[PDB]
Amino acid sequence: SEYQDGKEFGIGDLVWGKIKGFSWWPAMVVSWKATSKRQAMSGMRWVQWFGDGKFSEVSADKLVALGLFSQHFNLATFNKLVSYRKAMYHALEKARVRAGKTFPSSPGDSLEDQLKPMLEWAHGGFKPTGIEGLKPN
Amino acid sequence: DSSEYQDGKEFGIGDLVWGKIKGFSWWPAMVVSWKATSKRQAMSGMRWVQWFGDGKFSEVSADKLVALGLFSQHFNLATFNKLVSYRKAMYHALEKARVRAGKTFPSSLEDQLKPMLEWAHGGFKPTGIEGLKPN
Numbered sequence A: 001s002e003y004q005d006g007k008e009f010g011i012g013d014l015v016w017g018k019i020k021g022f023s024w025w026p027a028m029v030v031s032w033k034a035t036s037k038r039q040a041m042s043g044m045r046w047v048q049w050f051g052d053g054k055f056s057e058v059s060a061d062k063l064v065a066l067g068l069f070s071q072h073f074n075l076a077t078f079n080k081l082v083s084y085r086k087a088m089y090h091a092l093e094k095a096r097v098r099a100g101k102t103f104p105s106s107p108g109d110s111l112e113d114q115l116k117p118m119l120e121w122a123h124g125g126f127k128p129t130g131i132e133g134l135k136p137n
Numbered sequence B: 001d002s003s004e005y006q007d008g009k010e011f012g013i014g015d016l017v018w019g020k021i022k023g024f025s026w027w028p029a030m031v032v033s034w035k036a037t038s039k040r041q042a043m044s045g046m047r048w049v050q051w052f053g054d055g056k057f058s059e060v061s062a063d064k065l066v067a068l069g070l071f072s073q074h075f076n077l078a079t080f081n082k083l084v085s086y087r088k089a090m091y092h093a094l095e096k097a098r099v100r101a102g103k104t105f106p107s108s109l110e111d112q113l114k115p116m117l118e119w120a121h122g123g124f125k126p127t128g129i130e131g132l133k134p135n
């Protein structure tokens, strides 16, 4: 029922979302019931931002699939803000689990170290699954 | 309405669970509110848990949690024999279970642990897993 408005994106979808004064940031579409807030208005979606876990209401027409990765990733913000690197880690970890992807680990690799192969995977088109692997189920 | 962890998946605040992190055996924990953690709200489909034995907090997928009551299935005998840290975790977890279930034993950590472990492995009789519920 919720979000059945003929527009894009449903509960669980991984997305980039854009707030004024902010880069595109990774998020997951959620039900209004998870937010402790209120039902969304027409054509809007509740999203939860990776990294800080906060909830925002955003137009379905203003979200893009996380799978358009290199297009929306912002290297300048990544190098400038630890909060963006953490967001990218949590977003890509969710993507990895969904795709059944694995990466060679080694304690105690830092944040940047863990991110390196995840970012290469994302920039490379999420092989072998492709973006189909990012879908919820 | 709308509230913490109302995402349609299993597990609520206070639930005793086993949690699985890559690189670790299934480990006992309690589901906690994000407010207990000094961190941030958990992503939809995930829960904050506090691990027995070390008191640390982790954000864990509900798909990587199971009820502590499924004890024999998730208890790792190899890990128990190998790691003092896991035996310590078993003690604190099963002591919480014992108090919730209103269970008493005849009364050392290892000596204390023995009948608690027998009880858990045997299915938490007489209450069964219903006895482990919070409140």
Ligand SMILES: CCCN(CCO)CCCCCO
Pocket: A017, A018, A019, A022, A025, A049, A052, A054, A055, A056, A081, A083, A084
């Ligand atoms: C849409 C932009 C993402 N926000 C989420 C908060 O609602 C986080 C920004 C933190 C930047 C400070 O380091």
Ligand SMILES: CCCN(CCO)CCCCCO
Pocket: B019, B020, B021, B024, B025, B027, B051, B054, B056, B058, B083, B085, B086
């Ligand atoms: C998955 C279990 C979580 N704790 C660590 C908390 O982050 C494990 C304790 C290590 C035992 C080393 O002897």
